[PDB]
Subunit: 258 residues, 4 copies
């Protein structure tokens, strides 16, 4: 496959519906060697089993709210992969009260702080902690959404955190390019995942998107996985600092409705 | 003038070089009644005297890091202006260590937190506190920079913070529009101010911009003031959620240096 | 008013609903001296009567499909205005067969040629013909639509031509800036005009926009007129090469229909 | 390879430096069956040789200035490929006088007409003539440049033609999606080709981009070829109507090395 010879670290696998699970299956199909992280001890056994099905035994705990957890994880990874070729950042969060109802009434100083810290700062916190372990030709990838570029009802402060994340992709690509590292994002269309159930009226989003999207269907974790595999491979060597829309054309149309 | 009958609150005046100083003078010239805030006691003297030159005696303390400070300021303002027509948010900050050299090496979890809290959350924190005091026809305005959109050397985490602020403008305009309030920003070109001196090699950015901007000069606080007066008047009733470039055309050209 | 001392030429007045009529009214209210053009003799009478109400007796025929007609019109304008301060370009056309049904089936080579010649090339053709009659501080303005940025049903080849016009605004601002000229556009929301009746199902666009636009109403020729007067005045001296959205925020939101 | 089982038509091979040459070599490596077009009889011999080296003997004349030439080509293709899976459009032209010096002085009505007809209309002319020959899952691709988005010295009216082409990509994707066809573009960074050598001072554009691009090199036809192969394969099933930047990050940075 087109990822033979690469070693990639994958975050955010919580279940078989996760975008990260889809990305991991596609990368394994194309020949990558993989390593996995897990947020807390309730996820340990599920992730160890997923990793074994994909030929890996490298499974390490990591909570991105804590600098010490990130550092400890990369020091343990270093025992088996002293050098490696990049990582997939598939992590997002905001307190549940932030994501329902009018935006100005729901947002709070603490909710804004947590959303930006876990969904945007954590991407660069990981790069800082593994910078000297990355080979030339490495690639980093994160996942964003259209709520960074447009106001969407109920998405609320997560749209501000994703806008900071997309800027993070550009500043990171500009800083690390000279040493041979690329950094990009995929802006995915709506997909039913565990976290998806926390967005007020996510079921109407899905139905609507299917009706007015140019390809006339919502995208899958297999479509997102194949694009993620391409963006972390040497086939995408000419692409850096980019946000790639993997939403079936939804954002480039208007008023398809009638 | 075109602001006759309007009452507008202006934050951020720190010297006569300040962008907020040029916005206040243009708003006074067009007939508005004004009110001013000051960050701390070191700036109190100067702001009281500037307010007086523009015929105002409403000058109140406000540090937007604190929810209590914002609430107290608006309760005092409510004694003389029970209802009013909007405000100008001209406030930004990040720790000095964040703005020099490689972005991945300089950024820290706490530097990111402060930059986003003061430069982006504070705009929506003021709106929450005064929402029921705004008349039909009101307008809110904030100030952004091209670093939100492109990676610029040394601007570093302030670029991410400005990206979060421009998304804030979109989400606020969508939430407040139905009750009759508009929300926009000006993306200003580089101007020599007190805060500008904190950006490593600011003087070089300024020199480069003068030579390649289409109008062949950098913009002034008078240019920004006149556009701010327009965006807070009824003349701009058809504009909301927009980021307007007031940089002489710098962002729309490439390779004029050749 | 803020246009006192300026001489501006206005094209495109067809009737009292025209966007150009709202622009002329707003500039007359702000003190400008005006001059007008008319496409054919069937409009001659009306335009002479519209000009007379606004204090003008400068009414000249001009068909922008022909280089000779533009040159003759500016040579006649030169007898009373050898020097002037800019013009408003409010002209668009595509053959009727282009604007109904599937885009790929409807577009033709000649259909495409005419739409781009009249809606985009004519703006720069008028600039070439009066470049040495413009005073320092002059401003040019044109009108665009969201169809340049997004695929909209039935707008079809006009969307490609507006995309070409918006690039034209950037290339003209970059070339003419150094001698003292600014060039910009307004991207207006849908408004009921004579030309508007040529778009298949225009009445549905109108009602849809009214319900999901942040300000909850469609924009008027007075809203567009006031923004146009600002953009051709010295108040907007810091703005060039820009496309300003005057659509009540419609373009920055998504999925507002609940 | 990932294009096994697909049949793709390739336009635009002029020499071994051509972007379409790199695209052909990469699609052949990934298992596609190919067919080629040549503009006129001065190119026939060399394109026949290049095709033979990639195992193809399907080589047909096509000048996209003429509807009859495009129709005859698709009728001849139909004798060996009744159905096929998409095409690559790598074609552009404007008269040489258009690309030298100040844009407003150089552009003419005829120059503008030819630029838009050959660089933008031709993409949709080809789609109209082969629409009933495309299998479900087909993909169409064109090549654009940052001149569409920003004003660049000397590129002049080509920048307006590329803005029209990018809008053409959106309108094509929206019309053809429901029947199973995707349409995208690659916005490539500068590459030394025969056509590139017609732009005044191309040597300087190339050197400047090399120094300030985040990856600190200019892109190759192999980089572009690999991204083109992915975009015409089922690996990119979730992407349509998109303009993918393959310029090493050049467009997302500003003021590097200053
Ligand atoms: N599902 C969609 O429609 C969609 C669309 C666009 C983007 N996204 C984004 O894609 C990413 C993946 O989300 P998903 O939809 O796969 O949901 P998911 O619930 O399957 O995955 C979210 C993951 O975030 C991880 N996470 C949260 N906080 C963490 C912390 N402090 N430390 C370490 N890990 C933490 C969780 O463990 C979980 O595995 C997110 O960034 C999300 O915003 C989702
Ligand atoms: N100067 C430029 O070139 C430029 C260009 C684009 C945008 N901007 C932006 O314009 C705005 C104004 O900056 P300026 O250039 O006029 O500089 P300035 O130093 O004159 O003003 C900065 C203002 O921020 C205020 N401030 C900081 N922290 C605060 C806090 N916790 N509470 C209350 N007030 C606080 C200071 O008191 C000061 O009045 C900022 O948002 C800045 O990012 C400046
Ligand atoms: N009405 C809308 O919703 C809307 C929204 C956005 C942009 N626009 C644009 O605004 C401009 C003004 O249109 P309007 O809506 O006021 O319509 P209108 O029908 O009132 O005006 C169109 C004008 O085009 C002029 N025109 C056409 N061909 C010409 C030629 N060859 N030479 C000289 N003049 C010619 C006509 O004479 C007429 O005055 C157009 O560019 C249109 O695309 C309209
Ligand atoms: N080289 C670059 O830096 C660059 C960067 C971005 C985009 N592009 C674009 O890539 C495409 C390919 O150009 P290239 O750089 O590989 O140059 P090239 O000179 O190798 O190829 C140009 C091709 O255009 C074809 N062509 C011109 N007029 C035609 C007509 N009437 N009918 C049929 N074919 C015609 C020629 O035959 C030639 O094969 C163009 O669309 C160009 O604008 C090139
Ligand atoms: O970003 C998302 C976008 C969509 Cl459409 C659906 C789910 C998303 O992902 C999240 C949303 C909210 C929270 Cl609390 C956590 C995550 Cl991971
Ligand atoms: O955003 C700015 C952009 C420019 Cl070009 C110049 C000054 C700016 O303003 C700031 C920059 C840094 C800090 Cl710490 C605080 C502020 Cl107010
Ligand atoms: O561009 C427009 C956009 C809208 Cl929403 C409504 C009217 C428009 O203006 C035109 C539309 C079609 C033709 Cl043939 C001529 C013109 Cl002036
Ligand atoms: O579009 C291009 C962009 C670049 Cl940077 C280099 C080459 C390009 O290709 C062309 C340039 C001018 C003309 Cl007349 C025709 C073509 Cl094909
Ligand atoms: O500990 C409670 C919460 O804190 C956050 O830092 C984690 O990102 C989140 O996933 C968890 O629900
Ligand atoms: O003369 C017929 C047509 O020609 C076009 O050039 C004009 O723009 C249009 O208004 C008229 O209908
Ligand atoms: O104490 C340091 C700082 O904290 C504040 O929140 C900032 O806005 C800055 O102006 C102040 O100096
Ligand atoms: O013959 C002059 C020109 O006409 C064509 O339409 C072009 O595309 C170009 O390559 C040819 O040189």
């Amino acid at each position: 496959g087109f990822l033979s010879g690469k070693r990639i670290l994958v975050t955010g696998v919580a279940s078989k519906l996760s975008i990260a699970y889809g990305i991991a299956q596609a990368m394994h199909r194309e020949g990558a060697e993989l390593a996995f992280t897990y947020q807390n001890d309730k996820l340990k056994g599920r992730v160890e089993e997923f990793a074994a099905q994909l030929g890996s035994d490298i499974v390490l705990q990591c909570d991105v709210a804590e600098d010490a957890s990130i550092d400890t994880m990369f020091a343990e990874l270093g025992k088996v992969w002293p050098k490696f070729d990049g990582f997939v950042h598939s992590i997002g969060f905001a307190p549940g009260d932030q994501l329902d109802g009018d935006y100005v009434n729901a947002v709070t100083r603490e909710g804004f702080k947590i959303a930006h810290d876990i969904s945007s700062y954590s991407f660069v916190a990981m790069a800082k902690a593994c910078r000297s372990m990355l080979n030339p030709g490495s690639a980093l990838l994160t996942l964003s959404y259209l709520g960074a570029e447009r106001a969407i009802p109920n998405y609320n402060v997560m749209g501000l955190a994703k806008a900071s994340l997309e800027a993070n992709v550009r500043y990171m690509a500009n800083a690390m390019g000279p040493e041979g590292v690329r950094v990009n994002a995929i802006s995915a269309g709506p997909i039913r995942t565990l976290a998806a159930s926390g967005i007020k009226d996510f079921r109407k989003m899905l139905a609507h998107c299917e009706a007015v999207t140019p390809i006339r269907r919502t995208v899958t974790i297999e479509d997102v996985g194949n694009s993620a595999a391409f963006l972390c491979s040497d086939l995408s060597a000419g692409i850096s600092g980019e946000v790639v829309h993997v939403d079936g054309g939804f954002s480039i149309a208007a008023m398809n409705e009638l």
